[PDB]
Ligand SMILES: COc1ccc(C(=O)NO)cc1NC(=O)Cc1ccccc1
């Protein structure tokens with residue numbers, strides 16, 4: 050089946066942060082309004098037998114002292130008085146500040162995404178589902194002992210760790226967010242079994258700053274993980290077609306060479322033309338074909354067990370519009386059953402948020418650099434396969450580009 054993570058408590062926690070507000074409710078309620086929920090298997094978030102088991106899972110990646118600090122931050126924000134100077138210094142030491150502030154539910158909110166994405170990986174491993182979706186997950190910036198970019202716990206890293214250890218097992222991670230997937234890339238920098246690939250904007254001063262030239266050179270992993278971290282940085286303004294042609298051949302070549310056992314996809318919606326970032330010009334159109342739907346369709350055509358996660362996306366109704374179409378397309382590709390979605394938003398709880406026109410399309414009217422990157426990336430893929438003693442014909446792959 051196609052699985053999707055939701056639940057009453059899960060919904061409440063995912064809607065409890067100051068930055069993402071009620072976005073998750075819009076997404077799941079638009080999916081429901083389009084009558085997709087009967088087609089999907091509900092995957093319940095993971096819960097644990099004890100505090101010690103919870104810590105054992107989360108500290109598979111994060112440090113005990115960082116988890117302690119994040120939980121203390123929640124407790125301090127549930128009291129009336131301000132932080133002490135010593136507690137401020139403590140939170141500063143883990144970057145629990147500025148763009149990663151405290152709020153009354155910060156630990157439960159962050160933990161919930163881990164619970165959902167771990168539960169999703171388990172549903173793939175036991176073969177209950179062929180694909181699982183978690184629109185509450187996808188927080189790719191968090192590090193072992195550091196919050197970053199409103200990411201406090203890295204649910205992606207923990208989900209991937211569960212997949213690679215279920216065994217040889219290899220995972221391909223594809224990061225479609227506007228931003229570089231630095232936290233996931235870093236966690237697996239020395240690991241050849243998890244190949245990471247992020248496409249993103251990069252430019253001087255733009256967050257988080259990595260995933261680009263370091264004549265400077267491209268770092269790409271280390272140790273036995275050399276050549277296992279891939280990046281495609283793109284200039285602002287790119288449309289659906291140029292973005293699709295940029296990543297399409299890379300995706301096909303990665304699958305041919307790596308032969309992954311699982312694929313994990315981060316589908317942050319901040320590349321939409323209507324995102325307040327206003328950097329890329331992608332759409333959710335489905336006849337121009339949305340770069341997002343082009344990529345998901347290609348990935349799903351591989352017939353490899355796949356985890357689809359959320360991420361960025363700061364125009365909440367347009368993020369719901371996109372993720373509803375990704376959800377419908379996943380059902381259609383996996384089940385071979387046609388999903389017909391009306392071009393008009395159906396009546397439901399949040400109908401008023403899709404004014405003034407109430408349509409499913411977003412409200413938008415629409416290379417020598419990329420050829421150079423393709424040559425660079427093809428040579429890196431060759432070096433990866435040589436180092437890891439992997440089989441493949443340079444011809445079938447070269448001709449993809
Ligand atoms: C440090 O800033 C960020 C770090 C990570 C991400 C992200 O999406 N990562 O994948 C995004 C931002 N930036 C913003 O949220 C900017 C913004 C957008 C809408 C309304 C107000 C401000």
Ligand SMILES: [K+]
Nearest residue numbers: 224226228248
């Ligand atoms: K990305």
Ligand SMILES: [K+]
Nearest residue numbers: 237240243277
């Ligand atoms: K790696």
Ligand SMILES: [Zn+2]
Nearest residue numbers: 226228319361
């Ligand atoms: Zn982002």
